[PDB]
Amino acid sequence: RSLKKGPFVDDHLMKKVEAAAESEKKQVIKTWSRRSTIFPTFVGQTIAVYDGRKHVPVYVQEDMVGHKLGEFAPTRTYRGH
C-alpha cells in the first residue's frame, strides 16, 4: 500500500516466514505472492517467487526491504533481439 494505513503482506507468507525463524535457512519458501512487501523479518531466508512459469530464488537483504517480491523475479525474458 502507498499509504500510512499499511503495510501489506500476505498472511500465508508472513506466517511461514515467522515459522522460519527456526528454519536455519537450509530450507526455502515458495510463494505465488509477488504483491507482498518485504519486511526486515524476511531477511536471510531465500524466497522462491513464482514469475509465471517457475519459482525463481531471491536472497533478501536490508537493501531490498521496502520493495515487493516481484521486483526481483522478472516476468518477460528478453535477449536484445
Partner RNA sequence: CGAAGAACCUUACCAGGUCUUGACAUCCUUUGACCACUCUGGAGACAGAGCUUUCCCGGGACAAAGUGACAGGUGGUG
Partner RNA sequence: UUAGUUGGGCACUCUAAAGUGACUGCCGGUGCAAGCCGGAGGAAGGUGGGGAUGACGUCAAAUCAUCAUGCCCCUUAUGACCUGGGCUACACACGUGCUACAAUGGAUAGUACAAAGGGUCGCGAAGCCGCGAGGUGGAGCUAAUCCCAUAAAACUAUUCUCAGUUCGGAUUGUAGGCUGCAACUCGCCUACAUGAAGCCGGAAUCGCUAGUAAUCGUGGAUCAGCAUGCCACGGUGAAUACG
What DSSP state is assigned to residue 55?
E
CA–CA gap between residue 68 and residue 14 (Å, rounded): 13
CA–CA gap between residue 16 and residue 79 (Å, rounded): 35
Is the bond leading into 57 cis (omega within 30 degrees of zero)? Answer: no
Of the candidate spans 3-11, 13-21, 41-49, 63-71, the one that interacts with other proteins by CB under 8 A turns out to be 63-71
> Based on CB atoms, which residue is closest to other proteins, 21 or 66?
66
56 binds, among RNA, other proteins, none (CB under 5 to 8 A by kind): none
Q: Which of 21, 35, 44, 57 binds RNA (CB under 7 A)?
A: 35
Residue 32 interacts with other proteins (CB under 8 A): yes or no = no
Residue 32 interacts with RNA (CB under 7 A): yes or no = yes
Four-point Cα dihedral 48, 50, 54, 56, nearest 10: -40
Interface positions with other proteins (CB under 8 A): 61, 63-64, 67, 70-72, 74, 81
